[PDB]
Symmetry: C3
């Protein structure tokens, strides 16, 4: 939590607000290859992290990392193209800083997307997995973005996470997928967050799946945790980029280079699905 003071977040939200006529309701954190979602915004207004007052800049990828305000399928959004990861060096209170400010911007929902490895055998690369749960490996050890002294202005000391991924939004999504006439089913599973940048060995791959994880990635979990601490409605997707877990013959490993496809149709389909799902995010106007 530390590093930043409540006023820090307030000065950043206040600056954004005074700089964009936009008042975001939905915050979207695009995983790798999912940045083109920003292409769908109307009335887009871009802010390079760089420009925003206390916003962590990108460790190299700034030339990808930006904040885009606009409208997506009826919702006022703010998208984070190029999220921060623990592995780049950002302590978790920098990684999740955007979230805390989105909260002060007025954002009430956060849709997190990521590129993950398929641990569930059922999964196929290209698959989209609705996140129904997560295992926060960094959090178990101390790397919980909430670590440090708690600010009741954002939330409780011990926020529950057993209900992090909105059930309703997960039902809607599933329904949206069905009604889309999408044949291949919307997969659902537990995302296990792993830190380090290096990729998993077959042995680690096996602990991850025996732990009950369906997809492994290096992000999402921190942002979710602080979003939920904030009280935001959270739900997200995982784009399965590679498959993992076998030393029967572990030579080629379909290594994430499938990021070429992240600049392809699967990514595109997730972006579309996410865009259609805006219609399922309750308007703050009671929309009932």
């Amino acid at each position: 939590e530390n590093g930043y003071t409540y006023e820090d977040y307030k000065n950043t939200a206040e600056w954004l607000l005074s700089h964009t006529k936009h008042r975001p309701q939905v915050a979207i954190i695009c995983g790798s290859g999912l940045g083109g979602l920003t292409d769908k915004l109307t009335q887009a207004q871009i802010f390079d992290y760089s420009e925003i007052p206390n916003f962590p800049r990108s460790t190299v990828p700034g030339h990808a990392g930006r904040l885009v305000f606009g409208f997506l399928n009826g919702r006022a959004c703010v998208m984070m193209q190029g999220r921060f990861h623990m592995y780049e060096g950002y302590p978790l209170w920098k990684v999740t800083f955007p979230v805390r400010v989105f909260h002060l911007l007025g954002v009430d929902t956060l849709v997190v997307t990521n590129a993950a490895g398929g641990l569930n055998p059922k999964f196929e690369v290209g698959d989209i997995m609705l996140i129904r749960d997560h295992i926060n490996l960094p959090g178990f050890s101390g790397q919980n973005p909430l670590r440090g002294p708690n600010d009741e202005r954002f939330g409780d000391r011990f926020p529950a996470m057993s209900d992090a991924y909105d059930r309703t939004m997960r039902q809607r999504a599933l329904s949206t997928w069905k009604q889309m006439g999408e044949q291949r089913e919307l997969q659902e599973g537990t995302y296990v967050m792993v830190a380090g940048p290096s990729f998993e060995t077959v042995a680690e791959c096996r602990v991850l799946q025996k732990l009950g994880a369906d997809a492994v990635g290096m992000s999402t979990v921190p942002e979710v945790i602080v979003a939920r601490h904030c009280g935001l409605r959270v739900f997200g997707f995982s784009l399965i980029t590679n498959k993992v877990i076998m030393d029967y013959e572990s030579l080629e490993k379909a290594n994430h280079e499938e990021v070429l496809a992240a600049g392809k149709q699967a990514a595109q389909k997730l972006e579309q699905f996410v865009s259609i799902l805006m219609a399922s995010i309750p308007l703050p106007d009671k929309a009932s």
Copy 2:
């Protein structure tokens, strides 16, 4: 380990000693809702962390956190009302600082108490679980209070922990419980330490139980580790405050608010049990 120098601990123990006529033999670290145990001390002398020379102050809860010297059922004690946790921001060498000083005070036994979630289905909220073992999740990753350069004046480089929770004291306790005429049995199990302040998701809850943990909490393990490194006799209890692990329907989750009961009878019963157990802690006077 670092942050503090051996002389730091010595200056703190020396100050306490020169400030209390008391010479503690037993150190008791009260978990949440177990602070009323201090109410049982005779000849109580209170020290707010604040007042003690190198003692970490509380991140907000100072208004709960204090050190009380006194006598409990025949033993000269020093109780820590309101222990420190990793999640509040304290590096582990601050969390476990008290222990190192209790050691220099002359303390030879440490009874650790905590409020934990029931992972073992057998457990019921209100249950008291004698800690027979622990899984130090933060320790596996690097968060071991002993990390840093070792002081042979406190202990070895590689202290064993396979025998952390005194078997004798665990037998006595079990016997004390039986002889107390207590019907509901004294549960015994492995306490899994988890760091982060946010609560466990059903998926994490499942890794914890498949890992063989019976109770999950966010403390105890560090203090135990350094107590044992010090050579102190350690044994402890876990007050089961909530139950955990099911998404069959994971809406209400009996969230720790059962801390109301921590200001209730279950807490009270653990406090009493702990007090009766003083009679089972060998006097340094050879007491044979």
Copy 3:
């Protein structure tokens, strides 16, 4: 990764090179009790960490920790007698610093040796386990030596580790062992890295084996990770020093003191095996 700049490593390799006529091809990191391997070098040239420009000094054991250049069974080597461990306080980018410099020295292979606990029941103390895989517990949580901003000059952002331990070198080794006429077989397994200096409890011992680890230690994994990031050929051995995992009666625990044997025949045999294996490390001269 941070703490050091690319130029740091370059200034250290450059200094070593300008200080030793030696041009190492093989780097050997000796685990505990395996330092006598340095006794096998011809044309040995010793450098105390202390003397090398940006080289982390030892937290106490400097009086053991040194870098020895020489020739071992046909290969130009550089040995690290007394490696660094997370538990001594070294952040992982100090622990693995040697590796990055060995790389700039021209080293293309790294043989890592360690002393580990036997989790696989098949193992017997004294046994040598060829590392076929690893589970990086510290890495899952954030302690990955690669954490921080990536230097493409050393390697990729997301290096794969599924193929860390050279299969060929693991075949050769196995063959070398067979041809040595060694009766007791060369064990092979997954090494699980655990951080903290304190030893495992029976409960932790059980999570480690249910996780599929065969041997537990507190090193190797970081060095391997950065070696592989560097592109070096990595393979290694684990000398089983103690056995672990049972509370049926967990009193004496064959605690690592078997390090007496680390100054004995088992250690000696690993040192010999490692020395014979030099003949199996491809010469850079295309050696075909």
